[PDB]
Design a protein around this ligand. Structure first.
Ligand SMILES: [Mg+2]
Ligand SMILES: [Mg+2]
Ligand SMILES: [Mg+2]
Ligand SMILES: [Mg+2]
Ligand SMILES: [Mg+2]
Ligand SMILES: [Mg+2]
Ligand SMILES: [Mg+2]
Ligand SMILES: [Mg+2]
Ligand SMILES: [Mg+2]
Ligand SMILES: [Mg+2]
Ligand SMILES: [Mg+2]
Ligand SMILES: [Mg+2]
Ligand SMILES: [Mg+2]
Ligand SMILES: [Mg+2]
Ligand SMILES: [Mg+2]
Ligand SMILES: [Mg+2]
Ligand SMILES: [Mg+2]
Ligand SMILES: [Mg+2]
Ligand SMILES: [Mg+2]
Ligand SMILES: [Mg+2]
Ligand SMILES: [Mg+2]
Ligand SMILES: [Mg+2]
Ligand SMILES: [Mg+2]
Ligand SMILES: [Mg+2]
Ligand SMILES: [Mg+2]
Ligand SMILES: [Mg+2]
Ligand SMILES: [Mg+2]
Ligand SMILES: [Mg+2]
Ligand SMILES: [Mg+2]
Ligand SMILES: [Mg+2]
Ligand SMILES: [Mg+2]
Ligand SMILES: [Mg+2]
Ligand SMILES: [Mg+2]
Ligand SMILES: [Mg+2]
Ligand SMILES: [Mg+2]
Ligand SMILES: [Mg+2]
Ligand SMILES: [Mg+2]
Ligand SMILES: [Mg+2]
Ligand SMILES: [Mg+2]
Ligand SMILES: [Mg+2]
Ligand SMILES: [Mg+2]
Ligand SMILES: [Mg+2]
Ligand SMILES: [Mg+2]
Ligand SMILES: [Mg+2]
Ligand SMILES: [Mg+2]
Ligand SMILES: [Mg+2]
Ligand SMILES: [Mg+2]
Ligand SMILES: [Mg+2]
Ligand SMILES: [Mg+2]
Ligand SMILES: [Mg+2]
Ligand SMILES: [Mg+2]
Ligand SMILES: [Mg+2]
Ligand SMILES: [Mg+2]
Ligand SMILES: [Mg+2]
Ligand SMILES: [Mg+2]
Ligand SMILES: [Mg+2]
Ligand SMILES: [Mg+2]
Ligand SMILES: [Mg+2]
Ligand SMILES: [Mg+2]
Ligand SMILES: [Mg+2]
Ligand SMILES: [Mg+2]
Ligand SMILES: [Mg+2]
Ligand SMILES: [Mg+2]
Lengths: 156, 222, 185, 53, 51, 148
RNA sequence: AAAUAUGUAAGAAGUCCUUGUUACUUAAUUGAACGUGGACAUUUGAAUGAAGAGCUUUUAGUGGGCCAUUUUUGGUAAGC
RNA sequence: GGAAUACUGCCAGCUGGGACUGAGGACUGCGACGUAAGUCAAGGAUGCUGGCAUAAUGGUUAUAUGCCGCCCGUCUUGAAACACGGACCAAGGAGUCUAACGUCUAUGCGAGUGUUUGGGUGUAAAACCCAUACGCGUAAUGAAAGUGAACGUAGGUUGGGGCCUCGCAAGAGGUGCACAAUCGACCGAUCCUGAUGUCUUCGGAUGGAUUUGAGUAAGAGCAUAGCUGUUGGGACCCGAAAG
RNA sequence: GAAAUUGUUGAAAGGGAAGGGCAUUUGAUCAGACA
């Protein structure tokens, strides 16, 4: 031989895992995140876009809407840590939302159902936005840090 | 073949018996400590009332932390640091105060800080960095059965028993206190409060008896 | 750093195995370490360690020294154990019965023992008859009889035998050895 | 001290033990109350420097 | 295999020392003391404020 | 074999285990047994008291042989009888038929008396005896017969 | 006449009772030395510590030293 | 008069932001929460989602940039030294063998041990076999002539592992090898004593002594081999002026 | 048919030496593992 055989080999038997104790418990959101609250998206495709928050989804994400007809953002998932919660606020009591969950956004262009859903949720919101002057205009402009803005000082 | 639970019976039950004894025992100490504290408070007040002066008993127990490294140390203080079990910087141990140990403390003032520990800091020393010596082998406390297996002989069958033995400097302070490994502390988190450690506490330095100010140090180091 | 107070990394200083390379010896050791771990019998711990011993620390026990021991009060029926070799001794004329267990019996020792209707036994036959070493009498031979130790501790007034090759008058017996030749030792 | 020990050993024992006859070091002081009666505290200060010579 | 600080880890807090449960339960860490009012002798005061 | 030898282990270190200061030089002590009475005296006295000077008488042309005279103690003595033959004599401690032992034939010169023979007659032929050996021999009912 | 240094002691190899041995020793069965028999146990005789203690053999290198605080000699002094 | 606050201390009061780590691999423990079923943050990380599946991450390498980095070897108290060797590279280049030894260890056999000068024999410098001696050991001590190791269970005392007996156990007693300490006895030397006796000067019993020995006191050796150490040898390698 | 040392070719750096350490950028190069 070129090399002597080893005298002992490892077993090829793979152990099982120890019985880990790590309960998945529900994520409670920072108190600033109540539905109706306008969010500033900090990252991603719609970064800088100001948007309305609708529902906390079962995968911890946030359901938001532009409204699409205001600024072009659809019903969409958004990650709660990439969001600045502002202090301005629309009532969201005429918006259904029961429908929407994780599977609704399963990967599986745009299905008519989605397009229709957007109209049903947005006409409700739009009704509400119009109640406070300039809110719609506010909702169309992107957020942007200006020279000498200090996020650790600014109130949102 | 029973045993399955049929000797888990005896065991589970008997363990419950023991926590019971520990509960009644810990509730006892709590009373003991409160009325001790209050009596001296009312001692001091009664005396003022009477136009007099209540001088507390002298402290029976100190806690010593080595503050100096391992180099350039003269032989007499050196042997004493060893006998007190302080062979590395920031380690610490308890010392019951008598003339025959007082003079040891005297001989090592340049290299240690010490003072009179309160219940809170003895409690938190043991809860967090308290290890027994067991066939040597420095073993973490973490469960009461460890204590009772090794000190049960002297009464003392829980962690808070251990503490009660230390703080009252009970009849078995030698065995109890030797049982604890030297506490291994970190550097103070606040810092030392002084520009230079190696002067006495009294001269704006760090060593010597600093009496009750030992607790702030130790906590910042624990 | 640590103000150490004893050498670090210090070996205990006791053999742990024998230094011998002998299968059978190593097997007897397999036997007795098992016996030592799984019985609380002190006998087995002692025997374990003796097997580790080197030749010096295993002087031979003689059959006459064996006989002497059996003369102990309440001891004639004890089975004697020698962890080493057992030599013969024409100097005794009447040797008793008993059972000796040892590592080695010389031709003549075995004879003497067996001719008195005794029994020579190996340490493992010993193990099966007496797992807690019940009823046993462990004998060791004389260690400090060895020719070597005649010269340990050589020095003035110690009285202890020169390392010398030829001997006689005229070999290290003058100046320093007698009052009239400088001095004495 | 040996003779003494033997005494209070037998001496006690006969009563019904409870001895303690190892020597013990100077203990620290226990509490105590000091009165002021006939003994109000005298106040001293440090004193100025001076020569006398 | 991993030392857990009773001081933070209620679980092992309560494993060692079962009194902890009631200590907390009864607050005890904030015991109100009996409000008595003894007053110090003028002697005590006089000499506190002396020179 | 060189294989196991410390000089294999010293390759690569400068001084070969012999020191940077003290070095390995040719003959610092001097050669051989030099210095005996001078710089090597502490080791000679101690370890070798007796070395220098003389004692007793010179003997020119001493023929070792003249003094050939091995000792055998009663200690043994019975060993000079072959064991099969031996057991037979022990049993029948007896005049009229006691064993003859030619110790000279066995190659001994003197019989000495180390310790206790059985209480059995022996006839012991030897060149010399210690007073004691003869005594013990006789107390077993035996005799020494002086040969040459 | 200090301070710092330094000898010994803090028991089971201990203490107490009874009374054997000798050629030593006493006026003396007096002593002295060594003992037999009996009585008392881990608060059995201060503290602190002890990753144990004791012991034996054999052999290397070394046998230019230098420095700091304090004590300190010579020297005016010196990185003497 | 009646409060508040500061300061110091305590809580097994609650709670937010941030960093590093996730060792282990069925179960087994100590617990906690529940009326319970069951649950858990209780003897070491899992759940959910995405992107890439390639030089992307990672290795190697050159370069650049931050900070760091004096020439090795040597003797020396102290070397980067304004101390010495060394321009460069290959190849060679220094504790060996032998006689005789000390300690230790392994192995054979053991009061013995050592076949190898020789002989026998052979598949021929091998392997196998062997008689007589000899060497070391089993006796010491004296300059020598010489003498030559049991009062005694081969002794007493103290400690001793182990074993034995009692006890559920803790303990108590019995025996006690090795080893250690101590007091004795035995052999030789030296000194004293000097019985029974005698080719009247030989003989030297017996009992002793702050003397003395590398001794006895139920043997431990002999041989082969190894590391280390010792002496003689060119003697770790290289070097005189000389004779 | 090694090395010292040399010619050419290719690539790179170079404000009074060069070489080295920890680290990363950049360039060049390459292993593995995936299904
Ligand atoms: Mg779980
Ligand atoms: Mg939450
Ligand atoms: Mg728009
Ligand atoms: Mg200093
Ligand atoms: Mg301590
Ligand atoms: Mg802090
Ligand atoms: Mg800080
Ligand atoms: Mg702070
Ligand atoms: Mg400063
Ligand atoms: Mg800390
Ligand atoms: Mg001998
Ligand atoms: Mg000899
Ligand atoms: Mg050799
Ligand atoms: Mg070799
Ligand atoms: Mg090698
Ligand atoms: Mg080496
Ligand atoms: Mg090395
Ligand atoms: Mg090397
Ligand atoms: Mg080295
Ligand atoms: Mg060397
Ligand atoms: Mg050199
Ligand atoms: Mg000579
Ligand atoms: Mg002293
Ligand atoms: Mg201790
Ligand atoms: Mg230990
Ligand atoms: Mg040496
Ligand atoms: Mg030396
Ligand atoms: Mg020397
Ligand atoms: Mg020198
Ligand atoms: Mg893991
Ligand atoms: Mg793991
Ligand atoms: Mg691709
Ligand atoms: Mg690849
Ligand atoms: Mg890619
Ligand atoms: Mg580079
Ligand atoms: Mg630099
Ligand atoms: Mg040099
Ligand atoms: Mg110089
Ligand atoms: Mg210079
Ligand atoms: Mg030179
Ligand atoms: Mg040069
Ligand atoms: Mg070469
Ligand atoms: Mg053949
Ligand atoms: Mg031939
Ligand atoms: Mg043949
Ligand atoms: Mg022949
Ligand atoms: Mg001989
Ligand atoms: Mg003999
Ligand atoms: Mg002779
Ligand atoms: Mg004569
Ligand atoms: Mg005696
Ligand atoms: Mg006993
Ligand atoms: Mg006895
Ligand atoms: Mg004598
Ligand atoms: Mg003499
Ligand atoms: Mg001799
Ligand atoms: Mg040499
Ligand atoms: Mg020449
Ligand atoms: Mg010449
Ligand atoms: Mg000449
Ligand atoms: Mg060619
Ligand atoms: Mg390049
Ligand atoms: Mg790099």
């Amino acid at each position: 031989s070129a090399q002597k055989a080893p005298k002992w080999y490892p077993s090829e038997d793979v152990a099982a895992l120890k019985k880990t104790r790590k309960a998945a418990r529900p994520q409670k959101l920072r108190a600033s995140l109540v539905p109706g609250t306008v969010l500033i998206l900090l990252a991603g495709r719609f970064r800088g876009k100001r948007v309305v928050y609708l529902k906390h989804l079962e995968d911890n994400t946030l359901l938001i809407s532009g409204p699409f007809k205001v600024n072009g953002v659809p019903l969409r998932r958004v990650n709660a840590r990439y969001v600045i919660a502002t202090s301005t606020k629309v009532s969201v009591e005429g918006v259904n939302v029961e429908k929407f969950n994780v599977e609704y956004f399963a990967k599986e262009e745009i299905k008519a159902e989605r397009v229709e859903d957007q109209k049903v949720v947005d006409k409700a919101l739009i009704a509400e936005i119009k109640k406070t002057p300039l809110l719609k205009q506010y909702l169309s402009a992107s957020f942007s840090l200006k020279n000498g803005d200090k996020p650790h000082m600014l109130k949102f | 073949a029973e045993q399955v639970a049929a000797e888990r019976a005896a065991r589970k039950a008997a363990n419950k018996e023991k926590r019971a004894i520990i509960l009644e025992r810990n509730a006892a100490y709590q009373k003991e400590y409160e009325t001790a504290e209050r009596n001296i408070i009312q001692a001091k007040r009664d005396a003022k009332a009477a136009g007099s002066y209540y001088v507390e008993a002298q402290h029976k127990l100190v806690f010593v932390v080595r503050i100096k490294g391992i180099n350039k140390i003269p032989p007499k203080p050196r042997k004493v640091l060893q006998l007190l079990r302080l062979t590395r910087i920031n380690s610490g141990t308890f010392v019951k105060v008598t003339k025959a140990t007082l003079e040891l403390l005297k001989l090592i003032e340049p290299y240690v800080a010490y003072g009179y520990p309160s219940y809170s800091t003895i409690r938190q020393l043991v809860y967090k960095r308290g290890f027994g010596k067991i066939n040597k082998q420095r073993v973490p406390l973490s469960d009461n059965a460890i204590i009772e297996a090794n000190l049960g002989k002297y009464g003392i069958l829980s962690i808070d028993d251990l503490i009660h033995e230390i703080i009252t400097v009970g009849p078995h302070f030698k065995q109890a206190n030797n049982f604890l490994w030297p506490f291994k502390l970190s550097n103070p988190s606040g810092g030392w409060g002084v520009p230079r450690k190696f002067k006495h506490f009294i001269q704006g330095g760090s060593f010597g008896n600093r009496e009750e100010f030992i607790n702030k140090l130790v906590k910042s180091m624990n | 750093g640590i103000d150490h107070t004893s050498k670090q990394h210090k070996r205990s200083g006791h053999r742990t195995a024998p230094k011998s390379d002998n299968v059978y010896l190593k097997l007897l050791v397999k036997l007795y370490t098992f016996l030592a771990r799984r019985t609380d019998a002190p006998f087995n711990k002692v025997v374990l360690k003796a097997l580790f011993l080197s030749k010096i620390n295993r002087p031979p026990v003689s059959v006459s020294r064996i006989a002497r021991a059996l003369k102990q009060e309440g001891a004639a029926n004890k089975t004697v154990v020698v962890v080493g070799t057992v030599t013969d001794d024409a100097r005794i004329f009447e040797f008793p019965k008993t059972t000796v267990a040892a590592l080695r019996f010389t031709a003549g020792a075995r004879a003497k023992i067996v001719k008195a209707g005794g029994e020579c036994i190996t340490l493992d036959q010993l193990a099966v008859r007496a797992p807690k070493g019940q009823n046993t009498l462990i004998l060791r031979g004389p260690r400090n009889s060895r020719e070597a130790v005649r010269h340990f501790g050589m020095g003035p007034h110690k009285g202890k035998a020169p390392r010398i090759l030829s001997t006689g008058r005229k070999f290290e017996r003058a100046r320093g050895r007698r009052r009239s030749k400088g001095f004495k030792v | 001290r040996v003779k003494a020990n033997a005494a209070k050993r037998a001496e006690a024992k006969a009563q019904g033990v409870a001895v303690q006859l190892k020597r013990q070091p100077a203990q620290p002081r226990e509490s105590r109350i000091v009165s002021t009666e006939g003994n109000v505290p005298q106040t001293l200060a440090p004193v100025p420097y001076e020569t006398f010579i | 295999v991993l030392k857990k600080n009773p001081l933070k880890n209620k679980q092992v807090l309560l494993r060692l020392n079962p009194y902890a449960k009631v200590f907390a339960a009864e607050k005890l860490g904030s015991k109100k003391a009996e409000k008595t009012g003894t007053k110090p002798a003028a002697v005590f005061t006089e000499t506190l404020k002396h020179d | 074999p060189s294989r196991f030898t410390k000089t294999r282990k010293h390759r690569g270190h400068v001084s070969a285990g012999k020191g940077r200061i003290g070095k390995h030089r040719k003959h610092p002590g001097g050669r051989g047994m030099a210095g005996g009475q001078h710089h090597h005296r502490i080791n000679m006295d101690k370890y070798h008291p007796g070395y220098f000077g003389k004692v007793g008488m010179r003997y020119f042309h001493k023929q070792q042989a003249h003094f050939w005279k091995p000792v055998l103690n009663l200690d043994k003595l019975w060993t000079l009888i072959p064991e099969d033959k031996r057991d037979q004599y022990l049993k029948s401690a007896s005049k009229e038929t006691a064993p003859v032992i030619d110790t000279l034939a066995a190659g001994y010169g003197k019989i000495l008396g180390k310790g206790r023979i059985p209480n059995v007659p022996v006839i012991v032929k030897a060149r010399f005896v210690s007073k004691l050996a003869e005594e013990k021999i006789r107390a077993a009912g035996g005799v020494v017969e002086l040969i040459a």
